[PDB]
Amino acid sequence: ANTQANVADAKSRIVDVDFAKETSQMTKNQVLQQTGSAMLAQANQLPQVALSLL
Amino acid sequence: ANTQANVADAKSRIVDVDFAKETSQMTKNQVLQQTGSAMLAQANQLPQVALSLL
């Protein structure tokens, strides 16, 4: 029983996820998605300077 | 008759239980059972911090 407890602890250190870290990464990538979407939508409007010159 | 009395005394010293000691052990293990039950019930609620982070 002792050894089972210690070995399950050891395995958990390797296999399981950390919620405190992974939620932070998720929120960071959410914000980056919104920023990149805005920036790409603004980037697709660059060829319209030619209509002004034309 | 003398020898029977002395030998029954000798056997009682080996085989019979001590009530004063055994009742004390019983009460100690009762209290430990209640404490361990409370502590295990409180231990099964630890994975709920993730719902807070989530």
Short mmCIF file of C-alpha atoms in Angstrom, two decimals:
data_model
loop_
_atom_site.label_atom_id
_atom_site.label_comp_id
_atom_site.label_asym_id
_atom_site.label_seq_id
_atom_site.Cartn_x
_atom_site.Cartn_y
_atom_site.Cartn_z
CA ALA A 1 0.00 0.00 0.00
CA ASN A 2 2.82 2.42 0.84
CA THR A 3 4.62 1.73 -2.43
CA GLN A 4 1.45 2.08 -4.50
CA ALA A 5 0.84 5.55 -3.05
CA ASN A 6 4.41 6.71 -3.73
CA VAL A 7 4.49 5.31 -7.28
CA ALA A 8 1.14 6.88 -8.18
CA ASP A 9 2.52 10.21 -6.95
CA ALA A 10 5.59 9.68 -9.15
CA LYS A 11 3.45 8.91 -12.22
CA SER A 12 1.18 11.91 -11.62
CA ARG A 13 4.23 14.18 -11.66
CA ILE A 14 4.92 13.01 -15.23
CA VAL A 15 1.54 12.45 -16.90
CA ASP A 16 -1.02 14.87 -15.43
CA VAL A 17 -1.63 18.45 -16.52
CA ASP A 18 -1.21 21.60 -14.44
CA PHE A 19 -4.42 23.63 -14.49
CA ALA A 20 -2.87 26.85 -13.15
CA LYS A 21 -0.38 26.94 -16.03
CA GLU A 22 -2.61 25.63 -18.79
CA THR A 23 -5.47 28.08 -18.20
CA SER A 24 -2.97 30.94 -18.43
CA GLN A 25 -1.66 29.66 -21.76
CA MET A 26 -5.24 29.32 -23.02
CA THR A 27 -6.12 32.93 -22.18
CA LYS A 28 -2.93 34.23 -23.79
CA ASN A 29 -3.70 32.43 -27.05
CA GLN A 30 -7.30 33.69 -26.99
CA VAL A 31 -6.13 37.31 -26.87
CA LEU A 32 -3.55 36.66 -29.60
CA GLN A 33 -6.25 35.18 -31.83
CA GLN A 34 -8.40 38.29 -31.53
CA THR A 35 -5.43 40.58 -32.20
CA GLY A 36 -4.26 38.57 -35.21
CA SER A 37 -7.76 38.49 -36.67
CA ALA A 38 -8.02 42.28 -36.40
CA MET A 39 -4.57 42.74 -37.93
CA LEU A 40 -5.26 40.44 -40.89
CA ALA A 41 -8.58 42.15 -41.59
CA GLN A 42 -6.74 45.48 -41.61
CA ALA A 43 -3.99 44.02 -43.80
CA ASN A 44 -6.35 42.92 -46.58
CA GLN A 45 -7.27 46.59 -47.23
CA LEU A 46 -3.84 47.76 -48.43
CA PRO A 47 -4.31 47.48 -52.25
CA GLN A 48 -6.91 50.27 -52.06
CA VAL A 49 -4.32 53.08 -52.20
CA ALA A 50 -4.06 52.43 -55.94
CA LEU A 51 -7.70 53.43 -56.43
CA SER A 52 -6.80 56.75 -54.82
CA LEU A 53 -3.87 57.24 -57.19
CA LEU A 54 -6.08 56.15 -60.08
CA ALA B 1 -5.87 -28.78 45.13
CA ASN B 2 -3.02 -26.39 45.95
CA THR B 3 -1.24 -27.10 42.68
CA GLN B 4 -4.41 -26.73 40.62
CA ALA B 5 -4.99 -23.25 42.05
CA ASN B 6 -1.41 -22.13 41.36
CA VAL B 7 -1.35 -23.54 37.82
CA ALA B 8 -4.69 -21.95 36.92
CA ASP B 9 -3.27 -18.62 38.13
CA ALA B 10 -0.22 -19.19 35.92
CA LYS B 11 -2.37 -19.95 32.86
CA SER B 12 -4.61 -16.94 33.45
CA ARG B 13 -1.54 -14.69 33.40
CA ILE B 14 -0.87 -15.89 29.83
CA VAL B 15 -4.26 -16.42 28.17
CA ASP B 16 -6.79 -13.97 29.64
CA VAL B 17 -7.38 -10.38 28.53
CA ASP B 18 -6.92 -7.23 30.60
CA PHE B 19 -10.11 -5.17 30.55
CA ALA B 20 -8.53 -1.96 31.87
CA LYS B 21 -6.05 -1.91 28.98
CA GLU B 22 -8.30 -3.21 26.24
CA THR B 23 -11.13 -0.73 26.83
CA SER B 24 -8.60 2.11 26.57
CA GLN B 25 -7.32 0.80 23.25
CA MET B 26 -10.90 0.49 22.00
CA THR B 27 -11.75 4.11 22.83
CA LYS B 28 -8.55 5.37 21.20
CA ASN B 29 -9.34 3.56 17.95
CA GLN B 30 -12.93 4.86 18.01
CA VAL B 31 -11.72 8.46 18.11
CA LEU B 32 -9.16 7.78 15.39
CA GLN B 33 -11.88 6.31 13.17
CA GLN B 34 -14.00 9.45 13.46
CA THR B 35 -11.01 11.71 12.76
CA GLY B 36 -9.86 9.67 9.76
CA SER B 37 -13.37 9.62 8.31
CA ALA B 38 -13.59 13.42 8.57
CA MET B 39 -10.15 13.84 7.03
CA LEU B 40 -10.86 11.53 4.08
CA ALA B 41 -14.17 13.27 3.38
CA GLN B 42 -12.30 16.58 3.34
CA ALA B 43 -9.57 15.08 1.15
CA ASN B 44 -11.95 13.99 -1.62
CA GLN B 45 -12.84 17.67 -2.29
CA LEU B 46 -9.39 18.80 -3.50
CA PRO B 47 -9.88 18.51 -7.31
CA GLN B 48 -12.45 21.33 -7.13
CA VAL B 49 -9.83 24.11 -7.29
CA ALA B 50 -9.60 23.44 -11.02
CA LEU B 51 -13.23 24.48 -11.51
CA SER B 52 -12.29 27.79 -9.92
CA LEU B 53 -9.36 28.25 -12.30
CA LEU B 54 -11.59 27.16 -15.17
#
